[PDB]
Design an enzyme around this catalytic site. Structure first.
Site, PDB file in Angstrom:
ATOM      1  N   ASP A  55       4.348   1.581   7.660  1.00 37.70           N
ATOM      2  CA  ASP A  55       3.249   0.608   7.698  1.00 37.70           C
ATOM      3  C   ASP A  55       3.329  -0.390   6.544  1.00 37.70           C
ATOM      4  O   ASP A  55       2.312  -0.908   6.056  1.00 37.70           O
ATOM      5  CB  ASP A  55       1.899   1.332   7.771  1.00 37.70           C
ATOM      6  CG  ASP A  55       1.748   2.086   9.106  1.00 37.70           C
ATOM      7  OD1 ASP A  55       2.244   1.544  10.115  1.00 37.70           O
ATOM      8  OD2 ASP A  55       1.210   3.209   9.144  1.00 37.70           O
TER       9      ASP A  55
ATOM     10  N   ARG B 106       0.228   8.947   1.646  1.00 33.54           N
ATOM     11  CA  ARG B 106      -0.394   8.831   2.965  1.00 33.54           C
ATOM     12  C   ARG B 106       0.321   7.827   3.869  1.00 33.54           C
ATOM     13  O   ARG B 106       0.187   7.908   5.099  1.00 33.54           O
ATOM     14  CB  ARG B 106      -1.866   8.444   2.815  1.00 33.54           C
ATOM     15  CG  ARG B 106      -2.057   7.065   2.205  1.00 33.54           C
ATOM     16  CD  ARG B 106      -3.525   6.689   1.990  1.00 33.54           C
ATOM     17  NE  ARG B 106      -3.568   5.433   1.242  1.00 33.54           N
ATOM     18  CZ  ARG B 106      -3.571   5.382  -0.089  1.00 33.54           C
ATOM     19  NH1 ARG B 106      -3.559   6.504  -0.782  1.00 33.54           N
ATOM     20  NH2 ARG B 106      -3.569   4.223  -0.717  1.00 33.54           N
ATOM     21  N   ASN B 107       1.091   6.892   3.303  1.00 32.93           N
ATOM     22  CA  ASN B 107       1.838   5.905   4.077  1.00 32.93           C
ATOM     23  C   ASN B 107       3.340   6.176   4.012  1.00 32.93           C
ATOM     24  O   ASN B 107       4.162   5.257   3.980  1.00 32.93           O
ATOM     25  CB  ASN B 107       1.499   4.489   3.617  1.00 32.93           C
ATOM     26  CG  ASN B 107       0.046   4.133   3.899  1.00 32.93           C
ATOM     27  OD1 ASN B 107      -0.493   4.500   4.960  1.00 32.93           O
ATOM     28  ND2 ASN B 107      -0.601   3.446   2.972  1.00 32.93           N
TER      29      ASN B 107
ATOM     30  N   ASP C 256       0.835  -1.197   0.000  1.00 30.93           N
ATOM     31  CA  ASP C 256       0.000   0.000   0.000  1.00 30.93           C
ATOM     32  C   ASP C 256       0.875   1.253   0.000  1.00 30.93           C
ATOM     33  O   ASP C 256       0.683   2.179   0.790  1.00 30.93           O
ATOM     34  CB  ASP C 256      -0.972  -0.011   1.181  1.00 30.93           C
ATOM     35  CG  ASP C 256      -2.186   0.905   0.950  1.00 30.93           C
ATOM     36  OD1 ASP C 256      -2.204   1.671  -0.047  1.00 30.93           O
ATOM     37  OD2 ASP C 256      -3.120   0.878   1.789  1.00 30.93           O
TER      38      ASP C 256
END
Ligand SMILES: CC(C)(C)c1ccc(C(=O)NCc2ccc(-c3ncnc4[nH]ccc34)cc2)cc1
Length: 267
Positions: free
Chosen positions: A147, A133-134, A129
């Site tokens: 993450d 945002r990560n 992912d």
């Protein structure tokens, strides 16, 4: 166990945000060292499977990966203890126009991420992912990937289903959208979209389209196009990540070489 942190060693000080697993807080470990603390909401995670994998993730150590310090598993909710990043998530950081970023800074963010992903690739470890945002940003402006791998333990079908409302359609190559075929090359595709996010200062990819429309257009061969702040050579790098054929996409080692070459040529 060496992966186990005593929760009595934590001091909780501020709230940082909420994610797929619930709230995350800023705190101190042994009254001195900054940490982020994920408080895993009940029912959100395949906890037994994560705890076994936490051992593997503990030994993933790279200067550009957000470090996993340990887990607190003898109580519920369980805690995940990670490196604290003073400047928060990359997506919000990019959207703060006060930074007035130079394009050389944008390229260094891409290199930071690419170094982390080359390391993960060398360990045959998929992020699954990757997106702005990560990624997180520390007090020195260094971007680190966060993450990684954790998607395997999300219990929410809206996130895991390719038709799910929370699935990362806009970061996904055609073979993921069509067949759920995940590989090193889907991480490569997502990295190209992340480069586009960075040079677009955090705009949503395919911003005028729904997820369903994005999937259809990507299958027909539509692509993101050149952000205003990206040179032709930078655009060539991100575009190489989006070959329809997965085996024609570069590795992270090749992407890193290409990014370093452009840094020399543009600065
Ligand atoms: C679906 C997937 C990919 C599995 C997944 C994605 C995100 C989360 C998550 O937990 N997101 C919330 C979140 C994460 C990190 C931080 C944080 N960490 C360190 N230093 C910091 N400084 C400022 C914020 C901050 C704060 C909030 C969980 C799972």
């Amino acid at each position: 166990g060496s992966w186990e942190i005593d929760p009595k060693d934590l001091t909780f000080l501020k709230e940082l945000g909420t994610g797929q697993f619930g709230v995350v807080k800023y705190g101190k470990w042994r009254g001195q060292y900054d940490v982020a603390i994920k408080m895993i909401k009940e029912g959100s995670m395949s906890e037994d499977e994560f705890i076994e994998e936490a051992k593997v993730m503990m030994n993933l150590s790279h200067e550009k990966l957000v470090q996993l310090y340990g887990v607190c598993t003898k109580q519920r909710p369980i805690f995940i203890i990670t490196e604290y990043m003073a400047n928060g998530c990359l997506l919000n950081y990019l959207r703060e126009m006060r930074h007035r970023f130079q394009t050389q800074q944008l390229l260094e963010m891409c290199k930071d991420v690419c170094e982390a992903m080359e390391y993960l690739e060398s360990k045959q470890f998929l992020h699954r992912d990757l997106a702005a945002r990560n990624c997180l940003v520390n007090d020195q402006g260094v971007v680190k990937v966060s993450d990684f791998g954790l998607s395997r333990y999300v219990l929410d079908d809206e996130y895991t289903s390719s038709v799910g409302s929370k699935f990362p359609v806009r970061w996904s190559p055609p073979e993921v959208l069509m067949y759920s075929k995940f590989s090193s090359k889907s991480d490569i595709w997502a990295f190209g979209v992340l480069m586009w996010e960075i040079y677009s200062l955090g705009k949503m990819p395919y911003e005028r389209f729904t997820n369903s429309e994005t999937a259809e257009h990507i299958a027909q061969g539509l692509r993101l196009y050149r952000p205003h702040l990206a040179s032709e050579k930078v655009y060539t790098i991100m575009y190489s990540c989006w070959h329809e054929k997965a085996d024609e996409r570069p590795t992270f080692k090749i992407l890193l070489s290409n990014i370093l070459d452009v840094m020399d040529e543009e600065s």
